[PDB]
Structure formats: structure tokens, C-alpha cells
């Protein structure tokens, strides 16, 4: 319902969130992962025959703001902002509850807090490196665009056929 | 007077949450609500 | 199947909030669901702490948060304010209070002491 | 394969059909996509372990 | 809805394993999900009754 704002304090129990939080020192608010994905993934000719491409209603900056608000709410208020109002809660308590939700007692989190934080940081670093190195990981998106483009090409190519007449140029006949 | 205007969308209001080490917000009251959800099931049977 | 014939815990599936139950109604070529939902009302701030160290043994809550007023400490369910007196009944011990970050100091009352004193 | 179905191994039939543009390629692409999709369906439904 | 705004117990819905939380990210004409998952590592035999 409402765009949330992450606090300037980054004391999230040792969980380093700098990779996915919005980047302030950037022209836009897209994060490092978001910009990496954006970088990972002739037009006039189609328009020249009456095939227009409309612009999307929501620009990329609005989507980035929505995503940033969702992350801020998730990291600050847990899940309580989904149902009603936002209820602030310590992040460690939220993680203990998320462990309690899957059978294990909460005490485990407070026995291995630093180890879990280090594991999560290493995991986000590894996923960032995996996205940086290979380019096929975003195949599902890419195909879509390619597929769409292919169709349009064929349409324009259909303007070159004669369909049995003397010539394919309307002005000529 | 009244006229047609154009502007930039607002994605709702702006809100901030006072996160800290040892602060917790606990509700004291509740509200029972009723929400309507409408789903289509079938069209008009027809033949030609 | 889920919303009517049961209580589903899927978020935003049956209503918007904590789902309770639903009622179906007909409509021309369609159905209308009335979802009854429970939404938390006005809230209050409090000070918290992850655990309690009583006698060098960290204490953890069986179900609930350790809520704290400006003076005292209680255990409450998460979705409704309901203070309770700290007791060994609603808490359990797991190790000493040195690895836990955020530990605080407070006495943990025991229910056996009064009647063993009387006997 | 379109040219074998539409045209009965005829030369002039193929010559006339060539005037109709790239109709065959769309059908072939759609059917190949359907086949690959069936393979992916089986792989996804069964190879859970 | 389920993964972000809650803790889905539906097996293999959000990630592979016991689900903890998820983080969304934007992408050109799409969306990306980063699921945090809990998996046991070391196994030990025992006698039970
Ligand atoms: C959290 O992770 C970020 C990202 O790796 C860390 O910031 C890096 O710090 C090193 C130290 O020299 C720099 O070389 C990198 O350029 C920094 N990265 C970015 C994106 O700025 C940060 O130190 C980590 N810890 C905290 C508490 O933020
Ligand atoms: C929780 O809220 C309800 C309703 O807001 C309170 O019940 C009474 O509701 C009537 C109808 O609107 C009001 O006129 C009364 O003023 C409400 N009571 C009071 C004391 O204000 C109910 O009391 C509230 N409970 C708590 C614990 O706040
Ligand atoms: C904080 O809240 C508690 C719980 O309502 C208040 O309760 C006090 O508890 C002590 C211990 O039994 C009593 O001696 C006091 O008389 C209680 N307070 C009252 C007003 O009766 C406590 O007072 C609150 N502390 C504050 C508001 O500073
Ligand atoms: C809770 O109480 C314990 C013991 O009553 C405190 O432990 C003392 O901590 C100080 C340092 O702050 C040491 O110099 C003492 O040796 C410790 N033991 C005693 C018997 O005083 C502890 O600091 C208190 N506060 C907490 C745990 O937050
Ligand atoms: C949280 O704790 C750290 C260290 O204990 C302290 O520096 C910081 O000021 C605390 N934050 C708040 C909001 O109390
Ligand atoms: C709780 O504390 C915050 C910041 O200290 C304050 O803005 C708010 O009004 C307080 N009360 C609430 C959230 O009910
Ligand atoms: C349990 O015992 C079996 C049979 O002796 C053995 O094959 C297996 O490796 C043991 N499990 C572990 C974790 O060592």
C-alpha cells in the first residue's frame, strides 16, 4: 500500500545487505544485482510500415522503488506488514522465528549467529559472482524477447512476397 | 475552474519504520473485516 | 476447496490478512466469496531482549516475545498484548549466557518456592 | 514437412508454392517448439530426484 | 505473495529445501527471486526405539 523507507542504520545483526539494497551513488535507485541483470540483457524499419511499439505504463524507476519498498518492509517489519500495518521487530528475533517455523528451536540461531551471517554473506557473494560470470542464467527472459522479435520480422518479410500477382509494389501496379 | 490535468503518478505515500536493536511493536486491539472476491465460472452456452 | 472447506494459511489467498473463514454466494455466471479476516489494530512500542540470563543459564521463551515496560519484563503472544509473569513454566534453559548477543539481567520467578516454603 | 504434404513431389507445384512466402517456416517452428515443450514437460514432471 | 510476505510450507515451492525468506529483484520484462534456504549438512547414525 505504502512505499517504505529503509533506515540509514545498517545494524542488521551482522547480515550484510549492501548488495541488494538500493544504491544511493547511482543515477537511478537500482541495486548492484539489478544493474548487473539489466546489463546482462532496426527498430525504425518496423515503425516505418505502421507497426508502433507503445511504452510501458510503469517506468523502470517506479518498479525499482516498489522493489526497494518490498525489501525494506521485509527486512524491517518481517511479514506483519503484509496483513495489516507495519510492526518493527529486531532482525535476529525475526530470523529466530523463521527457524521456529520449520521445526528447529530458536536457540540455535543465538548459538551460531556469526556463522550464519558469514554463510549468508558468502552465499550472496557467490550468487553475485555466478551472475557476473555466465550469461545464460537469464535464458527464460531472453527467449521471450527473441521470440517476439522473430514474429515481427516474418511480418515485414511477408511484404516482399507477390502472392501470385505481377509485382509486390502497390505503387508499381 | 474545472479542467483536465496531467501529472506524474504517486506510488502511494511515503512511510518510514523506526528500526533499532531492541524495539518491538505489539498490537493491543483487532478488527474483524469482510472482503468480497468475485470470480467468473462459465460463459453462455451457444452453437452455430 | 481451501478457503471454505478449511482454514488456509496461504498469504493473501483467502482475504487480505489473517484468514478465518469464508462464505460462498452465487451470481449470474459466477461466484462471490465473502472472506472474514482478522486484522491487528492500534499497536504500542516496547523494549525487548532476545533472552534472559538468570543464574548463568540463558532462558528462552516457550512461545512469545520478552516484552518489557520501563521497569519490568513479561512474556506475550506476538499478535496480542497479554503480559505474563516470568516463570520456569513458560521458559526453557539452553546453555550459558555468553554466546547470546543482547542478553539482559532479570529474575525468573519459580512456582514451587512458595508451597515448599509452606511445607 | 509442408512441401511434401501440400505438393505431391511436383516441380511446378513447388514453384507456385514458393510465391506464397515463408508460411512453412512458422508451422515448422511451432511444431518443433511443441516437441521440445513435451520433452521439457516430461523432464520437469518426473526428474524431481 | 507466499514466499515474500510469509513462510510458505509448500515443499519445493519457494526454493529447494526448508524455506526461510525471499528477496525480489527487478529485471527487463520480468522478475528475479533470491530464496534463502536451510539444508542439513552432516549425518550421523543412531539406534532408536
Ligand atoms: C558488505 O559488503 C560490501 C560489498 O562487498 C563491503 O563493501 C566493500 O568493501 C571493500 C573493502 O575494501 C571494498 O573494496 C569494496 O569496494 C566494497 N564494496 C562496495 C560495493 O562498496 C562491506 O565492507 C561489507 N560490510 C559492511 C558492514 O557493509
Ligand atoms: C477495540 O476497539 C473497539 C472498537 O473500536 C472498542 O470497542 C468499543 O467500540 C465502540 C463502537 O465503535 C466505541 O464507541 C467504543 O468507544 C469502544 N470502546 C472503547 C473503550 O473505546 C474496544 O474497546 C477496543 N478495545 C481496546 C482494548 O482498545
Ligand atoms: C510498566 O508496566 C507494568 C505492567 O502493567 C506496570 O506494573 C507495575 O508492576 C509493579 C510490580 O508488581 C507494581 O509494583 C506496580 O504498582 C505496577 N504499576 C502500576 C501502575 O500499578 C509498571 O508500573 C509499568 N512501569 C511504568 C509505567 O513505568
Ligand atoms: C548481569 O549480571 C552479571 C552478574 O551479576 C554481570 O556479570 C558481571 O559483568 C561485569 C562486567 O560488566 C564483570 O566485571 C563481572 O565480573 C561479572 N560478574 C559479576 C558477578 O559481577 C553482567 O555484567 C550483568 N549484565 C549483563 C549480563 O548484561
Ligand atoms: C545498537 O547496539 C550498538 C552496539 O551495542 C550501538 O552502538 C547502537 O547505538 C545501538 N542502536 C540503538 C538504536 O540503540
Ligand atoms: C514508537 O516510537 C517511534 C519512534 O521512537 C515513534 O515515532 C512512534 O510514534 C512510537 N509509537 C508507535 C509506533 O505507536
Ligand atoms: C550408517 O551405517 C551404514 C551401515 O553400517 C553405513 O553404510 C552408513 O555410511 C552409516 N552412516 C554414516 C553417516 O556413516
From Swiss-Prot, chain A:
Effect caused by changing residue 81 to L: In strain: Eta/B.1.525
Site (Cleavage): 30-31
Region span, Heptad repeat 1: 113-163
Effect of residue 147 to H: In strain: Omicron/BA.1, Omicron/BA.2, Omicron/BA.2.12.1, Omicron/BA.2.75, Omicron/BA.4, Omicron/BA.5, Omicron/BQ.1.1, Omicron/XBB.1.5, Omicron/EG.5.1
Effect on the protein upon substituting residue 49 to K: In strain: Omicron/BA.1
This protein's name: Spike protein S2
Shown stretch of the complete protein: 786 to 980 of 1273
Function comment: Precursor of the fusion protein processed in the biosynthesis of the S protein and the formation of virus particle. Mediates fusion of the virion and cellular membranes by functioning as a class I viral fusion protein. Contains two viral fusion peptides that are unmasked after cleavage. The S2/S2' cleavage occurs during virus entry at the cell membrane by host TMPRSS2 or during endocytosis by host CSTL.
Organism, scientific name: Severe acute respiratory syndrome coronavirus 2
Glycosylation site positions: 16
Domain of life: Viruses
Coiled-coil regions, chain positions: 142-173
Curated annotation (Swiss-Prot), chain E:
Disulphide-bonded residues: 3-14
Protein's UniProt name: Spike protein S2'
Positions annotated as glycosylated: 45
Domain of life: Viruses
Function recorded in the entry: Subunit of the fusion protein that is processed upon entry into the host cell. Mediates fusion of the virion and cellular membranes by functioning as a class I viral fusion protein. Contains a viral fusion peptide that is unmasked after S2 cleavage. This cleavage can occur at the cell membrane by host TMPRSS2 or during endocytosis by host CSTL. In either case, this triggers an extensive and irreversible conformational change that leads to fusion of the viral envelope with the cellular cytoplasmic membrane, releasing viral genomic RNA into the host cell cytoplasm.
